[PDB]
Amino acid sequence: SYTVGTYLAERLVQIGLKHHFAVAGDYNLVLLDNLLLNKNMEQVYCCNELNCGFSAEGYARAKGAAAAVVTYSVGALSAFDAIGGAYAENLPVILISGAPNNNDHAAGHVLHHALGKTDYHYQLEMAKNITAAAEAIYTPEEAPAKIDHVIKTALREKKPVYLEIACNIASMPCAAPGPASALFNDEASDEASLNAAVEETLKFIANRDKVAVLVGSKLRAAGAEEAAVKFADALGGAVATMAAAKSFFPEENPHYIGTSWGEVSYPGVEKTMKEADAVIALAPVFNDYSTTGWTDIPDPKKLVLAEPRSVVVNGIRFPSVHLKDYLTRLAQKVSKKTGALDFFKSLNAGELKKAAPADPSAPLVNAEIARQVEALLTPNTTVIAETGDSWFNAQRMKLPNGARVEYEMQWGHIGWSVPAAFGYAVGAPERRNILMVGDGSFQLTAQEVAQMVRLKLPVIIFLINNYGYTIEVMIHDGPYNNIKNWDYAGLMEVFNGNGGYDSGAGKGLKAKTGGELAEAIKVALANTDGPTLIECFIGREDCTEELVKWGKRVAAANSRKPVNK
Amino acid sequence: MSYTVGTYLAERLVQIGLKHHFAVAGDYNLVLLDNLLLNKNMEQVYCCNELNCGFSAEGYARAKGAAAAVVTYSVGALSAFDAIGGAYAENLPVILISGAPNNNDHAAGHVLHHALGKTDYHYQLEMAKNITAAAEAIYTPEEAPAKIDHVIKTALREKKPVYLEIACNIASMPCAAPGPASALFNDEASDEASLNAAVEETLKFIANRDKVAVLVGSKLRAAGAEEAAVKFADALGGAVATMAAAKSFFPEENPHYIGTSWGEVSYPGVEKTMKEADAVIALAPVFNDYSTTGWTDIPDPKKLVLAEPRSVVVNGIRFPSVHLKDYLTRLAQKVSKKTGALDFFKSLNAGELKKAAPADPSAPLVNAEIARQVEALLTPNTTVIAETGDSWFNAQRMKLPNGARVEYEMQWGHIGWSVPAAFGYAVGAPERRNILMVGDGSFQLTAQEVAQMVRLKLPVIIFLINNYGYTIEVMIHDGPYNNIKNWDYAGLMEVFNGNGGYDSGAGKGLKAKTGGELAEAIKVALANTDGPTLIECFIGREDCTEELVKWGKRVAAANSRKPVNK
Amino acid sequence: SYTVGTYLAERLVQIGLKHHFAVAGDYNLVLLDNLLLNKNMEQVYCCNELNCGFSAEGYARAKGAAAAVVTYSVGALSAFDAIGGAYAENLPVILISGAPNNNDHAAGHVLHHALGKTDYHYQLEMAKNITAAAEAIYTPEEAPAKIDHVIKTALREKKPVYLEIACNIASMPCAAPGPASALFNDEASDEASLNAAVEETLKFIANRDKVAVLVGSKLRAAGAEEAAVKFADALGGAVATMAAAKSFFPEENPHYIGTSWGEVSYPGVEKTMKEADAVIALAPVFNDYSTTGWTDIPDPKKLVLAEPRSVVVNGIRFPSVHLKDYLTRLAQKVSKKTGALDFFKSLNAGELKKAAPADPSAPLVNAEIARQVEALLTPNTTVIAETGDSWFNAQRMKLPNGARVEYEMQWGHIGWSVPAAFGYAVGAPERRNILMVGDGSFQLTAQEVAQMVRLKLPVIIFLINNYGYTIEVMIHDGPYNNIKNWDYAGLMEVFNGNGGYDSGAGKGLKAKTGGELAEAIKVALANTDGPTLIECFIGREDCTEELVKWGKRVAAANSRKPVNK
Ligand SMILES: Cc1ncc(Cn2nnc(CCOP(=O)(O)OP(=O)(O)O)c2C)c(N)n1
Ligand SMILES: Cc1ncc(Cn2nnc(CCOP(=O)(O)OP(=O)(O)O)c2C)c(N)n1
Ligand SMILES: Cc1ncc(Cn2nnc(CCOP(=O)(O)OP(=O)(O)O)c2C)c(N)n1
Ligand SMILES: [Mg+2]
Ligand SMILES: [Mg+2]
Ligand SMILES: [Mg+2]
């Protein structure tokens, strides 16, 4: 039979979780005990609650969903930052918080970890701002319905949800869970709408021969990556990805022309998009970053807007049309529109100019790091790319089909990459997992590397030590862009703690030349027992051309005077 | 000199006594930070992450009375909210300022970086309202002066944190100039008739109750009533005990001080004395599940005089608008001697708190030996920051020379608070001997802020208690979740130093596995005036205070009590 | 082509609305103009915004959904009371509010109708507490998605939603609406769950022969009224309705045993429910009123809980199982369980004792009113029954199959009945519409009768004038239960205003004896041009036995001392 806690544990197992992440607190200890009863998933502990949230977020990138368990208030509030992030990045992360004994409500009790007033409804209220569903469970009888509701909602909407459970009901009996299939049950496309949206799209492109396809960062959330390839092959048009959609489309596909990112697009792409008679945008997010400071906004008159659950085409909005069904059906009826792809080729714009192997003993430069990392990419690889110049370095890399890039470009919380890489590596241990993180970002969440050591995960970490916040320097410079340098490589033996209570097998290495980097990378690949951090030394100014160009536009957008009135 | 939204804020902060403000840069606040840097009367101090930034400000407020933290929209503010809730719980006026979207982006259908991906940016304000005494968003320059003044006045009056957000494009725009600083501290005075009636009712109440005990609460400092409490205690000549979270809010060398009142983990004799008292005068107390030892130690309502910072309940009458400082002062002038409870305490011959004697220097280090050596470091110029964990209980057992301070975060109780709080405190009180007692588990949440101690060359002495896990949690309810990955904590110091890298540092990391190693480590720490010293102390998990074990069982029982029926 | 306003108007027409309700205000005047452009529905004006909301609420009871349009703040806030009520009663009412010019946001402007601060986000925030979805529209481009989202949500959840529209965008162009079918698109039951829920139900009742069916007040929201009859006929068990579900099951059906309402149940019903081995509850709401002050709570060990979208049976919870599918599938596989019905019959408990025709010239008594109203019931009739003794009078009435009763027993806002009867009558003009309202309730919303006169609706109103709040008196008595008496009958010629600017055809009559009532009823039926108010005079103490019994239990529940921490 089930308890509130084991009911939750089963539902989490049913949606495919093999792990959940946690930080203990007296308001959740019994809950954690009940979760441990289900042997079909492991309980993974984190350093702090912000990292715990981001670890779950990374896990969701690998496995589709995730769960984080924290304690009331002191745990939940910081975790909310990671949950907001999961919301921004369309990931079904389930945050569960311990909560006060249910006897303490409406009793005039001040409790530890709370604000010092006698009510405990505020945490729930805060959570409602950053989740698709949020439920508080005060009695065992209520648990099943509330658990099922937030989980179904998380899976359907691809957004995080919130649960809190009174600490004294976690072991109390409740109903048992029905079949897992109930949790994935979703509406199908409305047939009449699906067909009308496809027909209207055909009418729209009837006499527009240069059709371009723009791949957006919600393509995965729509589960429409495979259908986009089918559509692209049938169309035979030009396909470009928005920056945050890197790896959401096969880069070896003959129709792929590279990154569309305004004035920092791949060669030829910017012109091709400008020349296109029609742009079919697949689940895009157009924000101030992705439009390069509002300088690159798609022409409304040329745009077919295909969202995950609706299509706007030919001046008509079609709700209840799922992107996957739309792309698949379209691929069956659409005819060849090679116009934009032919135009692209006729530009002879060339490939992205990349640097050649540097002199091994020469001082390390940014391009040389990017080159060697790119040469590590296999169809089995995932690159977690942190906010900072790593965004742009990663964007310039050619991906073998199957290789993945993970970006957090909507939330853009520096430090995300470290615990996300941990969570991801736990969820996809079979992959070659690479983390590209700047020194500034690493300092926010560095400790979670110790958990990589703990669980013996072979994450390869490229710590770019350019002594400060370079992306920030390229937006607007000041003393606040300077940081205290660490001996990052030396941090590894600290987290190992060899000769202490336990042990570890992480490695820390320094790379000041191309040759040192190459040797470091060999050591990293041979290290199967723990993470390897490679501390790369480059100058602050030594960054991509793209960052500098993009940075100026971003700063301009941010600072534009107020308009009148 | 004319003002901008940014320099108006900077001046107000300087006017309330800030010599520093804490920040983490983000594109939504870069220009704001530039404007704050224009005022040379305070420094801009940078933090590793926003949670640490908030707790650094929180620690600074403990040293200087108020503080400010500046973060970026959404990704910065949300984690900082945890520290701001903490400031609320601990009654500290921390001002959180967040950068915000360009004011052209509102009601425009724009998706912005760092936000949820909808086109609305009101949610952060809404969340902030839950954990502050005031929260204001500034979208135009004209609105800035009123909203800045309002949240600052509120923070200072209520002794609670407040929230401001400023559109990133208005930080340099002109606005009115600030008037006199005195306007910011302007508060109502006690209502005279009420003040007198509360004092007279108190005298009537204790007329035929000779055993009067004074219970010092953790809001005594927030009420600014520490000094007046001593005056009242000396006039009364009764027994004075402090609640756990009030440690150091009353002079421990005062002849009336009988020690800690904390239920079954009170100092010897104190529990009985409080039970026997005919009247208990509670000065600004917080009675919660922790401070009542799992609801086992609750003051007798029929014996209680409840003197809160701004009201008094006495003799079955509530008197609002009576400030604790005035009440204590007015009372010290009229009250007569009530030595009953103090005489009773002495007659118990309950003795002093039994403390261990100097251990054999080469013998394996034990918890009591650490506590002994730390206690021997206490001077009238010392402050101990004591982390949630057994360090609560070790610190509680220490005798304080008059003037020595202990800082507790026992209401919020966010493990890891101690590290950035000690940083912020040390920035605000560099003249003091600053000691940090933090467990290994807590240290891992916020460890990086030690790098900022190294950066600003702050001589904080850190006792890292390495008992390999969450011992306080183990003593509440044990499971695999209480185990952590051990670090080489001492070695973390040379990492944050980064000597031979881009800059340098003068922190020191040392290990102590015996009393003798600890003693030598402490010498090195005191001689290190150029950076923090972390002393990694090795003890066993079960090697903790008796008090923690007793208190832990009661807490677990309270937490787990079955539901009652409608 | 469409504007923000005409897009909304079309969506409303697409979901079946033939009317929408409004109160003009400068923030919504242009919006109202755009709604008037769609000739497929009428714009109906109300006296005040509270009545406007309840009119829409009553319309939803007739047509399945409804819409109310009000002005910013001064209009919306009172209307929120009616929207909360629609939420409590599971009705898809769409509230649309005018809002400030979109130039006034983040501008430091104080605006008329607002709080006097410079921000206008508070109304939206308040609305979120009482709706299933709430969206503010500040630009035309955003309108289509936000409109579609709240309407789909209202229809799926059967809950009200909220929209606000900047006053200056109502005429601005936006995309056009796709097919209406997209708005009704909903997930189907999860097959595995549906089958498992049915099989578990069969196992549960395998060796429990006395099976009783308890019909709940969410049966209509689940669209499962018809399927419940099919299941009941197959089962051949005893069927009782909870008070608020009156008319949600055919009372001429051989299996119907009457009202189950604790100690105020129909004769024999209370015992039958106590004796049942299994109780199958179809979409019930168990609250402090419906359990008669927590005195009548179903035995958890006997209960099969069939909610609109889930089933809890045999200690297992099955989400994603729609009540309609569950009942239908169940009716195909279940075998005869006549146990509880046989037991009921064997009680020889008799019919509900009703009074016989009173002496026509004798002073009017409550029972005589109830008798004559009951005799007016036809398969084409709807009785709107107000909170008060009218609840209990209506509950005692035998319904010909097809006759409807409308209750607001969850919200229970006195005065709801008057504007609800207006809205209902507008939506179902073909029915004989009867309103049973007490004098105290009538005073809250009396003016909406003028709108019945205005639109020439033949609503028959029984105004029960017992000079005060009798239901309240029977709960707990005090001076606050006394009201100022009106000449209610005379109110009709006031609303007619004959000899003034316009005219009216309402009638007001008094009934102080059975004979006067009978004659009054004849005049009411012959009056096809306007409402007829029949003012019935009875004593304060002359109420149903049920109200007195139920009232005591309710008072006891309300006043029970606090249990200790
Ligand atoms: C939680 C949070 N706080 C601040 C920011 C603003 N921000 N964005 N990028 C940065 C600096 C980037 O630092 P690094 O990791 O060293 O990147 P690079 O120097 O460009 O290789 C900041 C401070 C942010 N995006 N998220
Ligand atoms: C942010 C936050 N997360 C979790 C908790 C719960 N908690 N309280 N105390 C602990 C364990 C602390 O262990 P240490 O710091 O090593 O101290 P010791 O008791 O001396 O072992 C936890 C995990 C908390 N109080 N705050
Ligand atoms: C808006 C609102 N305000 C107050 C109430 C409380 N209330 N509930 N029933 C009543 C009295 C009912 O008055 P009447 O219509 O005369 O009903 P009867 O006299 O029992 O036929 C009150 C005053 C309520 N249910 N709703
Ligand atoms: Mg850097
Ligand atoms: Mg420890
Ligand atoms: Mg009445």
PDB file of N, CA and C in Angstrom, chain C residues 264-288:
ATOM      1  N   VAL C 264     -32.188  15.234   6.602  1.00  0.00           N
ATOM      2  CA  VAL C 264     -33.296  15.824   5.844  1.00  0.00           C
ATOM      3  C   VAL C 264     -33.494  15.153   4.478  1.00  0.00           C
ATOM      4  N   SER C 265     -33.081  13.889   4.387  1.00  0.00           N
ATOM      5  CA  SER C 265     -33.301  13.081   3.195  1.00  0.00           C
ATOM      6  C   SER C 265     -34.778  12.777   3.035  1.00  0.00           C
ATOM      7  N   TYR C 266     -35.158  12.353   1.836  1.00  0.00           N
ATOM      8  CA  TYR C 266     -36.478  11.788   1.609  1.00  0.00           C
ATOM      9  C   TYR C 266     -36.647  10.531   2.478  1.00  0.00           C
ATOM     10  N   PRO C 267     -37.902  10.175   2.790  1.00  0.00           N
ATOM     11  CA  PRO C 267     -38.156   9.003   3.628  1.00  0.00           C
ATOM     12  C   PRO C 267     -37.459   7.770   3.076  1.00  0.00           C
ATOM     13  N   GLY C 268     -36.715   7.075   3.932  1.00  0.00           N
ATOM     14  CA  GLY C 268     -36.094   5.819   3.564  1.00  0.00           C
ATOM     15  C   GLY C 268     -34.696   5.955   3.003  1.00  0.00           C
ATOM     16  N   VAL C 269     -34.383   7.133   2.464  1.00  0.00           N
ATOM     17  CA  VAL C 269     -33.115   7.327   1.772  1.00  0.00           C
ATOM     18  C   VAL C 269     -31.941   7.273   2.730  1.00  0.00           C
ATOM     19  N   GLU C 270     -32.082   7.898   3.884  1.00  0.00           N
ATOM     20  CA  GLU C 270     -30.975   7.910   4.828  1.00  0.00           C
ATOM     21  C   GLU C 270     -30.565   6.487   5.235  1.00  0.00           C
ATOM     22  N   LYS C 271     -31.552   5.648   5.549  1.00  0.00           N
ATOM     23  CA  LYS C 271     -31.286   4.262   5.917  1.00  0.00           C
ATOM     24  C   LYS C 271     -30.665   3.477   4.777  1.00  0.00           C
ATOM     25  N   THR C 272     -31.219   3.631   3.576  1.00  0.00           N
ATOM     26  CA  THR C 272     -30.716   2.918   2.408  1.00  0.00           C
ATOM     27  C   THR C 272     -29.240   3.216   2.173  1.00  0.00           C
ATOM     28  N   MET C 273     -28.853   4.480   2.317  1.00  0.00           N
ATOM     29  CA  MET C 273     -27.459   4.881   2.127  1.00  0.00           C
ATOM     30  C   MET C 273     -26.559   4.327   3.224  1.00  0.00           C
ATOM     31  N   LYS C 274     -27.076   4.287   4.448  1.00  0.00           N
ATOM     32  CA  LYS C 274     -26.340   3.717   5.564  1.00  0.00           C
ATOM     33  C   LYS C 274     -26.140   2.203   5.382  1.00  0.00           C
ATOM     34  N   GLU C 275     -27.125   1.531   4.792  1.00  0.00           N
ATOM     35  CA  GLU C 275     -27.093   0.077   4.653  1.00  0.00           C
ATOM     36  C   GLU C 275     -26.307  -0.398   3.451  1.00  0.00           C
ATOM     37  N   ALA C 276     -26.154   0.475   2.462  1.00  0.00           N
ATOM     38  CA  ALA C 276     -25.479   0.105   1.229  1.00  0.00           C
ATOM     39  C   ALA C 276     -24.098  -0.487   1.502  1.00  0.00           C
ATOM     40  N   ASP C 277     -23.728  -1.503   0.732  1.00  0.00           N
ATOM     41  CA  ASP C 277     -22.405  -2.099   0.832  1.00  0.00           C
ATOM     42  C   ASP C 277     -21.404  -1.278   0.033  1.00  0.00           C
ATOM     43  N   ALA C 278     -21.915  -0.582  -0.976  1.00  0.00           N
ATOM     44  CA  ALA C 278     -21.093   0.252  -1.831  1.00  0.00           C
ATOM     45  C   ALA C 278     -21.893   1.468  -2.261  1.00  0.00           C
ATOM     46  N   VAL C 279     -21.244   2.623  -2.246  1.00  0.00           N
ATOM     47  CA  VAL C 279     -21.851   3.845  -2.749  1.00  0.00           C
ATOM     48  C   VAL C 279     -21.026   4.386  -3.902  1.00  0.00           C
ATOM     49  N   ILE C 280     -21.647   4.511  -5.066  1.00  0.00           N
ATOM     50  CA  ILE C 280     -20.947   5.058  -6.210  1.00  0.00           C
ATOM     51  C   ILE C 280     -21.345   6.507  -6.357  1.00  0.00           C
ATOM     52  N   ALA C 281     -20.421   7.397  -6.003  1.00  0.00           N
ATOM     53  CA  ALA C 281     -20.670   8.837  -6.021  1.00  0.00           C
ATOM     54  C   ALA C 281     -20.230   9.450  -7.354  1.00  0.00           C
ATOM     55  N   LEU C 282     -21.197   9.975  -8.104  1.00  0.00           N
ATOM     56  CA  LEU C 282     -20.930  10.575  -9.405  1.00  0.00           C
ATOM     57  C   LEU C 282     -20.719  12.079  -9.283  1.00  0.00           C
ATOM     58  N   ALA C 283     -19.458  12.510  -9.331  1.00  0.00           N
ATOM     59  CA  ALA C 283     -19.123  13.935  -9.313  1.00  0.00           C
ATOM     60  C   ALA C 283     -19.768  14.720  -8.143  1.00  0.00           C
ATOM     61  N   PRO C 284     -19.515  14.277  -6.905  1.00  0.00           N
ATOM     62  CA  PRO C 284     -20.114  14.927  -5.736  1.00  0.00           C
ATOM     63  C   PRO C 284     -19.284  16.089  -5.221  1.00  0.00           C
ATOM     64  N   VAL C 285     -19.937  17.031  -4.537  1.00  0.00           N
ATOM     65  CA  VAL C 285     -19.248  18.048  -3.764  1.00  0.00           C
ATOM     66  C   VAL C 285     -19.659  17.864  -2.303  1.00  0.00           C
ATOM     67  N   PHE C 286     -18.720  17.416  -1.476  1.00  0.00           N
ATOM     68  CA  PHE C 286     -19.000  17.220  -0.072  1.00  0.00           C
ATOM     69  C   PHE C 286     -18.497  18.446   0.678  1.00  0.00           C
ATOM     70  N   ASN C 287     -19.407  19.333   1.068  1.00  0.00           N
ATOM     71  CA  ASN C 287     -19.002  20.503   1.828  1.00  0.00           C
ATOM     72  C   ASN C 287     -19.769  20.547   3.145  1.00  0.00           C
ATOM     73  N   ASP C 288     -19.617  21.625   3.914  1.00  0.00           N
ATOM     74  CA  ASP C 288     -20.255  21.671   5.237  1.00  0.00           C
ATOM     75  C   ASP C 288     -21.784  21.707   5.118  1.00  0.00           C
TER      76      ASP C 288
END
